[PDB]
Design a protein around this ligand. Structure first.
Ligand SMILES: NC(=O)c1ccc[n+]([C@@H]2O[C@H](COP(=O)([O-])OP(=O)(O)OC[C@H]3O[C@@H](n4cnc5c(N)ncnc54)[C@H](OP(=O)(O)O)[C@@H]3O)[C@@H](O)[C@H]2O)c1
Ligand SMILES: OC[C@H]1O[C@H](O[C@H]2[C@H](O)[C@@H](O)[C@H](OCCC3CCCCC3)O[C@@H]2CO)[C@H](O)[C@@H](O)[C@@H]1O
Length: 219
């Protein structure tokens, strides 16, 4: 054990938004979706936060590219708010819901239902999910590479703990605006430049009407 290699990918507007204030996220073009799916096809797991599941109900599977098998889907959900009918819980792939060790009668029942549906539930942390410990658990399961799709709040959590290895960002040629709109990285935020995350621009190229930037995280 140690922890998986983590790639953070996202599609954002020039002003760093992941969606409008009304959750409209038609940012990535077709070319970018193909690129993303190729990445999905090459990792052991895809990780996303409950916030994204609630707002977008994604499948998190390889569907617009030749697919053999799908990577494990991981959802960070502290209070187990994942809707019982969320697509991320369908049978297209294996799914793991990472929640906290906190408990109540209703939560335990929900866990039983999820397990009955073939969904695995991992308890890890108090108050909020302990990402570092979760990485150990996922590594022991054989998941050595994970595509982190976010969104904003989870990304903060991952970057704060320095668990991200590399970053790929697709920047769309548009501007959304909005102090309330979700950005690539939200959460608390670093107080000074000294403690912020450092990166190294490794590669970049246009894709469709936008551009892709690839960075390596300087740990
Ligand atoms: N354009 C893209 O590529 C892209 C990709 C992904 C998402 N998005 C967008 O991002 C938007 C906003 O997402 P969001 O920020 O509200 O949700 P999020 O970033 O996916 O985070 C969801 C939840 O994870 C939970 N969590 C549990 N433990 C955590 C920890 N240790 N660190 C951080 N989070 C933890 C938090 O709630 P609890 O404590 O209740 O569990 C948090 O609200 C979504 O609406 C979606 O449209 C865009
Ligand atoms: O564990 C999940 C369930 O939680 C509640 O069940 C109550 C249930 O409705 C309620 O009747 C029960 O208390 C029963 C009455 C007490 C009175 C004091 C002596 C012991 C028996 O307490 C349960 C919780 O411990 C909710 O009422 C249920 O809807 C929910 O499914």
């Amino acid at each position: 054990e140690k922890k998986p290699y983590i790639i953070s990918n996202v599609g954002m507007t020039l002003d760093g938004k992941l969606a409008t204030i009304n959750n409209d996220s038609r940012i990535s073009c077709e070319e970018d979706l193909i690129r993303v799916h190729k990445i999905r096809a090459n990792v052991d797991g895809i990780m996303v936060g409950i916030g994204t599941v609630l707002k977008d109900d994604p499948r998190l599977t390889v569907h617009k590219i030749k697919s053999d098998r799908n990577p494990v889907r991981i959802v960070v959900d502290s209070k187990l708010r994942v809707p019982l009918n969320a697509r991320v819980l369908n049978k297209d792939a294996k799914t793991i819901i990472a929640t906290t060790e906190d408990t109540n009668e209703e939560k335990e029942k929900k866990i039983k239902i999820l397990e009955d549906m073939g969904v695995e539930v991992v308890k890890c942390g108090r108050g909020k999910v302990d990402l570092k410990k979760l990485m150990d658990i996922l590594y022991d399961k054989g998941i050595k590479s994970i595509l982190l799709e976010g969104g904003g709040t989870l990304n903060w959590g991952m970057f704060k703990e320095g668990l991200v290895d590399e970053v790929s960002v697709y920047i769309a040629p548009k501007i959304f605006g909005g102090k309330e709109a979700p950005t690539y990285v939200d959460g608390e935020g670093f107080k000074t430049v000294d403690e912020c995350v450092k990166l190294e621009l490794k590669n970049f190229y246009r894709l469709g009407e936008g551009i892709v930037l690839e960075f390596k995280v300087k740990k």
